[PDB]
Amino acid sequence: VVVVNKQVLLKHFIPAPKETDMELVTTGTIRLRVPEGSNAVLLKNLYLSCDPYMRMRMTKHEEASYVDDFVPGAPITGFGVGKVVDSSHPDFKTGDYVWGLIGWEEYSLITKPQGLFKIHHTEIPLSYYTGILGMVGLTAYVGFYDICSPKKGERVFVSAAAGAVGQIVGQFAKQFGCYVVGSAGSDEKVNLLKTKFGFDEAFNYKKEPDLTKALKRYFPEGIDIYFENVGGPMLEAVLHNMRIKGRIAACGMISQYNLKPEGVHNLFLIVGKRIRLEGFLVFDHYGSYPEFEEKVVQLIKEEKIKYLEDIVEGLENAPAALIGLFEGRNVGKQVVVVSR
């Protein structure tokens, strides 16, 4: 059996990204069997994740950064969920479902199957393994329980709080016993934070004249913990409102990914307030996954965590949905359905 395999390719390096910086192609095929003699796994790709860090990979870097750049002319890759068609690797059998880095394509031959995780709970919707039970959820789990060193009762702020990482941090934090406030870019998202996601309070950053004062309002006694997804002047504001011994988990600074650079002027406050500002990367924490899968599956089962996906249908729509990320167009975790 040789079948058609559509692909989305990076046309070329970027210096914001445009939908034209990628190209769907239909003039390609794959054999539905793993090469003889390999330790490899062939996946039918079911779901894709759009993640902001994918932007960086579309630019060429002289010195090595944290992930390999994309190769022009080759498919885009990123997190996704797949079904095992064929396998010459012992830990994976035909009919198993998995998640991990795969190609923006209908079918991927995974030469390094050590970096695929087997899906242990079929009871759960498979798309969850793009986000809440995939990379994004684990990011939240590490960022909050580990980097933020939280303590019950502490005052927690979360930027980009309706996003995939944000919405999870908030719920983790409320269930730990913290006061949790979120910021987002639309009243629809703010509504979701207060009504679906259980946030003690939230507000629209686009519709607040002074971020520093806005935060003073929700944190009269200042902020103990800032889960940082956005960066820029929102960080300055937070710094102004941080409490002695406050902690900032630097998850991302998405405001800067396509800009060029914006400056932070408050940093000296980190001294007077004895703040720990610490970045982290989820790739370093895959060891914590098994415990995390169990915690979060139970949380879902018990209806004690909520999760909103933004779903887009068809591989052809993946470039748009990725670009859309950066303009706030996603309402929840951006997933692309390749086949169901």
Ligand X SMILES: NC(=O)c1ccc[n+]([C@@H]2O[C@H](COP(=O)([O-])OP(=O)(O)OC[C@H]3O[C@@H](n4cnc5c(N)ncnc54)[C@H](OP(=O)(O)O)[C@@H]3O)[C@@H](O)[C@H]2O)c1
Contacts with its own copies, residue ranges (CB under 8 A) = 65-66, 231, 235, 250-253, 256, 261-281, 284
Instruction: Supply the DSSP symbol for 115.
Output: G
Residue 272 CB, nearest distance to its own copies (Å)?
A: 4
Nearer to ligand X, 83 or 257 (CB): 257
- Work out what residue 216 binds among its own copies, ligand X, none; the CB cut-off runs from 5 to 8 Å by kind: none
Residue of 233, 89, 261, 200 lying closest to 98 (CA atoms): 89
Q: Structure tokens of 75? A: 């498919």
Q: Which residues bind ligand X (CB under 6 A)?
A: 51-53, 136, 139, 159-160, 162-166, 184-186, 189, 205, 229-230, 251-252, 254-255, 271, 280-282, 325-326, 328, 330, 333
Strands 116-118 and 242-250: unpaired
Nearest residue by C-beta to ligand X? 163
Radius of gyration of the chain (CA): 21
51 binds, among its own copies, ligand X, none (CB under 5 to 8 A by kind): ligand X
The pair of three-digit structure tokens given for residue 31, joined into one six-digit string = 């054999």
160 binds, among ligand X, its own copies, none (CB under 5 to 8 A by kind): ligand X
Tell me which amino acid residue 155 is. R
* Min CB(326)–its own copies separation in Å: 15
CB nearer to its own copies: give 1 or 271.
271
Using an 8 Å Cβ cutoff, are 98 and 118 in contact? yes
Residues 288 and 66: their CA atoms lie apart, in Å, by 20
Distance in angstroms (rounded) separating the CA atoms of residues 189 and 272: 34
Closest distance between its own copies and the C-beta of residue 66, in Å? 4
98 binds, among its own copies, ligand X, none (CB under 5 to 8 A by kind): none
Q: Which does 65 bind (CB under 5 to 8 A by kind): its own copies, ligand X, none?
A: its own copies
For ligand X, the closer CB: 85 or 325? 325
Q: What angle do CA 87, 89, 91 make, to 5 degrees?
A: 105
Q: What's the distance, Cα to Cα, between the start and end of the chain in Å? A: 21
